Amino acid sequence: GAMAEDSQEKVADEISFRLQEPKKDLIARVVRIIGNKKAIELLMETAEVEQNGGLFIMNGSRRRTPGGVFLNLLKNTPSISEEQIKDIFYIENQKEYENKKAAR
RNA sequence: AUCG
Numbered sequence: 001g002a003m004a005e006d007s008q009e010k011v012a013d014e015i016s017f018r019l020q021e022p023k024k025d026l027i028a029r030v031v032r033i034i035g036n037k038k039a040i041e042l043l044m045e046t047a048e049v050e051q052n053g054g055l056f057i058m059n060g061s062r063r064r065t066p067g068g069v070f071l072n073l074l075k076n077t078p079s080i081s082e083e084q085i086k087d088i089f090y091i092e093n094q095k096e097y098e099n100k101k102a103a104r
Numbered sequence: 105a106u107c108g
Contacts, residue, residue: 022106058105068106075105089105 008036015039019046019067026089027067033088034080042073049076 012028021027031039049055049069054076057068074085 019106026106056105057107059107060105062106065106071105085105092106 004037004040006036006040008032008039011036011039015043015070018043019070021067023092026092027070030070030074030088033084034077038080042070042077045073045076046070049073 008031012024012031015021015031016024016027019027030042034042046069049072053064055064055069055072057063057065057071062068071089074080074088077085
C-alpha cells in the first residue's frame with residue numbers, strides 16, 4: 001500500500017472479480033497485453049463508462065453486461081492501438097485446424 | 105465487441 005500495488009497477477013485477479021468475468025483468461029489477457037497499470041486505468045474508466053451507461057458488445061442484443069462494459073474499454077481506451085484490441089478479445093480462443101488442409 |  002504505497003502507490004497502487006499494480007502487480008499484474010493481482011490486477012488480473014482483481015479485474016475478473018470486479019467484472020464477474022465468465023472467461024477470466026480473457027480479462028487477465030487484457031492485462032497481459034496492455035499492461036498492469038493500463039488495466040487499472042481501465043478500472044477507473046469503467047466508472048466513467050458506468051456514469052454514462054455505454055456498451056455495445058459483440059451481439060448488441062445484450063447491452064451493458066458487467067464484464068462487457070470493461071470490454072467496451074478496449075474501444076473507449078484513449079491510448080491503445082486497435083490491433084491490440086482485436087488481438088485480445090476478438091480472437092477469443094479461436095484456433096486453427098491447419099486452416100484449410102486438415103490432414104486427418 | 106461477453107452468443108457457448
